[PDB]
Amino acid sequence: QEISYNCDYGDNTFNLAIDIGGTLAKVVFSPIHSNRLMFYTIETEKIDKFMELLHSIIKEHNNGCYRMTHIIATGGGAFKFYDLLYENFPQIKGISRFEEMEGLIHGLDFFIHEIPDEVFTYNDQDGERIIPTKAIYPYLLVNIGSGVSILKVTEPNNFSRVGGSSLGGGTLWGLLSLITGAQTYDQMLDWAQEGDNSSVDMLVGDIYGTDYNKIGLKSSAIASSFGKVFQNIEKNNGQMFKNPDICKSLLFAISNNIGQIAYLQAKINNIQNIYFGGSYTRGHLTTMNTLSYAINFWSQGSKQAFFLKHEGYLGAMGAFLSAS
Amino acid sequence: QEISYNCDYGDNTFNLAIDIGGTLAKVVFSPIHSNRLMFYTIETEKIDKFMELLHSIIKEHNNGCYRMTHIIATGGGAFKFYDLLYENFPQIKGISRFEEMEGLIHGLDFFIHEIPDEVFTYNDQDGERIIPKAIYPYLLVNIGSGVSILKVTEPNNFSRVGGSSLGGGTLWGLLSLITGAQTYDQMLDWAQEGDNSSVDMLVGDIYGTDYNKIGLKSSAIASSFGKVFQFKNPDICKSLLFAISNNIGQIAYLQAKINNIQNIYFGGSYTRGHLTTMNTLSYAINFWSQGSKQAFFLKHEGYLGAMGAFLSAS
Ligand SMILES: CC(C)(C)c1ccc(CNc2nc3n(n2)C(=O)CC(CN2CCCCC2)=N3)cc1
Ligand SMILES: CC(C)(C)c1ccc(CNc2nc3n(n2)C(=O)CC(CN2CCCCC2)=N3)cc1
The missing domain is CATH 3.30.420.40 (ATPase, nucleotide binding domain)
Structure with a gap:
């Protein structure tokens, strides 16, 4: 479900951001010059298929040009599957990691500040209400995947994981x-x-x-x-x-x-x-x-x-x- | 699992305390002059047996004397089974009701202050340790079917601050x-x-x-x-x-x-x-x-x- 965003393409790098969770592996990328952010999700356990999708995205959205592709990995898999990734993408500009809690917060903060029609309230009485998004801070993020992590953000760049729960x-x-x-x-x-x-x-x-x-x-x-x-x-x-x-x-x-x-x-x-x-x-x-x-x-x-x-x-x- | 205690038999009344919870129905009483506290639990599902037990207790430990028996009921059963209680004990001295969170806290606070060998810590590393102001404030996590949580800041100052359906x-x-x-x-x-x-x-x-x-x-x-x-x-x-x-x-x-x-x-x-x-x-x-x-x-x-x-x- 693509988003329109004016990206900076000044360094002519095709950025493949991957987030490899316990169960779900997410990818975010923007074909150079497109001004489009694109999103897919595949199961982590289908790790082969995840890599085929990565090659496929380079092939179709960046003209098969590995040398200009930068992989940035987050979630547990950024460590756990790093070797396999390095091994499967010999020709890329590089593969680097980004810290998971920083990633979550950096992504959420971006959506909160920059993407219209992203943030919304919902209950059965009121229906759906889109928010027209520093009375932002502080805010909590409850990240529910297989499990649950809870992070606070007191201001831009100041965040921490304050807890989580195995019931997710x-x-x-x-x-x-x-x-x-x-x-x-x-x-x-x-x-x-x-x-x-x-x-x-x-x-x-x-x-x-x-x-x-x-x-x-x-x-x-x-x-x-x-x-x-x-x-x-x-x-x-x-x-x-x-x-x-x-x-x-x-x-x-x-x-x-x-x-x-x-x-x-x-x-x-x-x-x-x-x-x-x-x-x-x-x-x-x-x-x-x-x-x-x-x-x-x-x-x-x-x-x-x-x-x-x-x-x-x-x-x-x-x-x-x-x-x- | 009797506690031996110096109770006040000032009223000369046999006080039969019941707490009928969602699953468990509990009873605490003292035969007059025994200085004994006695405790039994029966399933709420078997409410009829719990009723039969209350009669039994009166017969066995108060000498068949309904007239001098005072029931104090707490838990939701005090509401839901009021009718059955009154039907069972029309002729006793009184059926009183006591609010459940107050009962929890009063129960806990008494055990903490008055009964030796009641409060212990336990873990696998240190084993069981019996504990012998520095008391307040304290928390109660009451786990049965579900969970209630209470804060107690002074003797007669407490509240339920929340609870959980995952019990x-x-x-x-x-x-x-x-x-x-x-x-x-x-x-x-x-x-x-x-x-x-x-x-x-x-x-x-x-x-x-x-x-x-x-x-x-x-x-x-x-x-x-x-x-x-x-x-x-x-x-x-x-x-x-x-x-x-x-x-x-x-x-x-x-x-x-x-x-x-x-x-x-x-x-x-x-x-x-x-x-x-x-x-x-x-x-x-x-x-x-x-x-x-x-x-x-x-x-x-x-x-x-x-x-x-x-x-x-x-
Ligand atoms: C995917 C990823 C990020 C690895 C992950 C891991 C765990 C979970 C959910 N599970 C969970 N989260 C917790 N859990 N259990 C605890 O037991 C305690 C706790 C807080 N604790 C930390 C140390 C100082 C004291 C407070 N946070 C979600 C996501
Ligand atoms: C047997 C007995 C005592 C009847 C009982 C009832 C419920 C539970 C456990 N379930 C539970 N407890 C909660 N729950 N859910 C909530 O959803 C919210 C909540 C607190 N909320 C209430 C309003 C003001 C803000 C705080 N307390 C255990 C035992």
């Missing part, structure tokens, strides 16, 4: 894949969307028979994700539970958890604006709503969720920008 | 449906035997090395179940126990940090003298605070609310 997209995809046997992330999202978590979850209402306003929770609030199930090829003979219900429950469970940790991190760091990055939302309305509600709920309106059109490309984008 | 229920639920484990006990056996890297993506899997710039070694868990969408039940168990326990750990740390708290007491039905769990929770606290915060555990971790209700009669 990878937990969601993994649990629901094994349990319900969904084959796509899309399919589990559709299953979630039409499901009912109250079949598998304990609500406050189940415990109290009513609201619990003294602690600020309604009957419908979730007390225990999957709380009803102990209290009741393999799992198919295990299952007495609706797959869509399971998918809903676990999507709420993980999102709400991310929401809470984001909130707590924002709290500590006196941040109002929370940006969600990574591969997790994917413009999925329910997901964005759950995240926005969690932030709103915990902050009582005082803090705000934000999403990004190019949410999965923060790292690769930052890497790209470093090669200036 | 023991999430663990028992996923592990029971995925693996087939019968009991919380047999999850810990499976987990004891387990290697989580089978299903968890580690830092070392992503970087081929440490990421010490962010303070994470190659063996740190980047994504629980992160290998699963590209399986040994022991591995699953250990993965999810880490997943849930570390999360609770992190959230406890963050809440403690927001509130400038050093000491974090765990209550509920989750630790239950399970060494691994207690180690996991301690380590998370340790890790996130670089050793400057501390997990504490309680011999009667499950009875905080009943205990606080019991004390409200006093």
Whole structure:
């Protein structure tokens, strides 16, 4: 989903920014003179195919001219696959690394300051609102991939990772894949969307028979994700539970958890604006709503969720920008 | 698991404190003049048996005298099963209600101040240590089905500052449906035997090395179940126990940090003298605070609310 941006092409270098995660490898590049930023994603585990795509991009978008190509790598793979990369691209101007947290922040900051129609709020009440993007700072980034990293940015170039969590997209995809046997992330999202978590979850209402306003929770609030199930090829003979219900429950469970940790991190760091990055939302309305509600709920309106059109490309984008 | 205590039998009343939670129904009482505190737990699912037990207790330890029995009920069951309670005890001295967070805190604070050998620390390196102002402020992480978190800054100054739906229920639920484990006990056996890297993506899997710039070694868990969408039940168990326990750990740390708290007491039905769990929770606290915060555990971790209700009669 290309972006129009006036790039500086003064050094006549074709910059291939790659971000090789645990699961997803992202590429950001701009054919010289195009004023277009282009983005692809392929699985990390298809490492061969990832390299074919890289050669293919040089072939088609830079006239097969290796000598003018600079590879800039970020994410774990910048170390882990560096040798393989150096070996597979003998003729390039060079392959260099850019630090992962710097990349994320550099990419996000760029989108926040330079790309119209990139940053948006979303809940079910309000719909989608595009932001017309130094009341920027400080801001939080919650980067949801397989796992979750949380970074603060106090000002341009001043950032740090303040924490993270092992309960991310990878937990969601993994649990629901094994349990319900969904084959796509899309399919589990559709299953979630039409499901009912109250079949598998304990609500406050189940415990109290009513609201619990003294602690600020309604009957419908979730007390225990999957709380009803102990209290009741393999799992198919295990299952007495609706797959869509399971998918809903676990999507709420993980999102709400991310929401809470984001909130707590924002709290500590006196941040109002929370940006969600990574591969997790994917413009999925329910997901964005759950995240926005969690932030709103915990902050009582005082803090705000934000999403990004190019949410999965923060790292690769930052890497790209470093090669200036 | 009786505590011996010098109670005030000033009212001459048999005070029967109950805390009916979502899964667990708890009871604390003292036979008059015994100076004994007694504790039983029955599943909420078996509410009828819990009711039968309350009758039993009155018959056995208060001499069949309903007239001098005062029930103090807390937990959501005090609301949801009010009708059953009144139906069971129309003729007792009173059925009082005590608010649940106040009961938790009153229970905890009494155990911290008054009962020797109740509060301990535990990890794999140092073993169990019994602890014998410097008390406040403190945190309570109450884990049953879900999680409540409370801050207590002075004797009668506390609040629930947040909570989590990812509790023991999430663990028992996923592990029971995925693996087939019968009991919380047999999850810990499976987990004891387990290697989580089978299903968890580690830092070392992503970087081929440490990421010490962010303070994470190659063996740190980047994504629980992160290998699963590209399986040994022991591995699953250990993965999810880490997943849930570390999360609770992190959230406890963050809440403690927001509130400038050093000491974090765990209550509920989750630790239950399970060494691994207690180690996991301690380590998370340790890790996130670089050793400057501390997990504490309680011999009667499950009875905080009943205990606080019991004390409200006093
Ligand atoms: C892909 C990449 C970047 C390697 C990665 C790694 C891990 C995760 C998510 N997992 C995670 N993140 C954490 N985790 N676990 C902890 O256990 C503690 C923690 C903070 N801790 C650091 C040391 C000082 C004390 C505070 N941050 C996401 C992405
Ligand atoms: C049994 C009993 C006591 C009924 C119970 C209920 C819920 C849970 C766990 N679930 C949970 N706890 C939360 N949750 N979710 C939230 O979503 C938000 C939240 C705090 N929020 C409320 C409004 C002001 C800002 C802070 N506390 C455990 C035990």
